[PDB]
Amino acid sequence: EEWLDILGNGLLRKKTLVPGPPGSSRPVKGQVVTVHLQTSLENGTRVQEEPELVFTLGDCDVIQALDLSVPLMDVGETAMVTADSKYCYGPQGRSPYIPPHAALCLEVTLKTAVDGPDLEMLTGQERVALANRKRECGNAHYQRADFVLAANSYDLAIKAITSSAKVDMTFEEEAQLLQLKVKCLNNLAASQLKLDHYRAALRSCSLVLEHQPDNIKALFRKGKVLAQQGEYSEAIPILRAALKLEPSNKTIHAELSKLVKKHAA
């Protein structure tokens, strides 16, 4: 009927187009919600149409705009949401193209809302599917340079893998999930390093190298972190160990050269 100014700043506004059924309720944090999303730019250009977008409320799987506006919708409601770029694809834009600082008009139809899964009660197959979904979310956030959101999705991906103390999985499932955990921890290190969270990036790097001691990405990232911290004595053998695996790699050379030149104070 009228525009609701959600955050009190005219940056995230919601207008109900079609209300939900008389008995409908709002979804709560943690619920797996399914929506039909029609995204368009401020000038009216349509971006994409996801007829069955599935995401966990409050987990920031896609964009902040959805996690902030969907809890204000009843299951079965169709609403128009105008959101500023800061709650969307920000000062950088995205892959199915969004211009930098572009305000979005989201036509959302909340379809279903089911209770969130008990991570402790997930099957090996479900655990693989949930962790991979969170990993794919984190990857999408990382490509845009949203390292705070990328780190969160990788953190959720890991939490889903490691909460298996009460379910009996096969050896093949445990091994598959270990391979996924190392990929998520390396991805987390890539994200932490971009946020200068050196102590955290180091932990993630060291955990990856405990499973895979010849992981070139984890070696280079540990070396780059130790170099940016000023631990040149510890960084040079690690950066050399990574060059030993790929001697022609220009990025590892450029990193070593930068480190040795700076090691002159």
């Binding site: 984190g138 990857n139 990382y142 490509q143 990328a150 990929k183 390396n186 991805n187 890539a190 070139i216 990405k217 280079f220 990232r221 790929e246 022609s248 790699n249 990025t251 590892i252």
Partner: peptide
Amino acid sequence: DTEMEEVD
């Protein structure tokens, strides 16, 4: 050959 900065 390996792109550092790329995520897996």
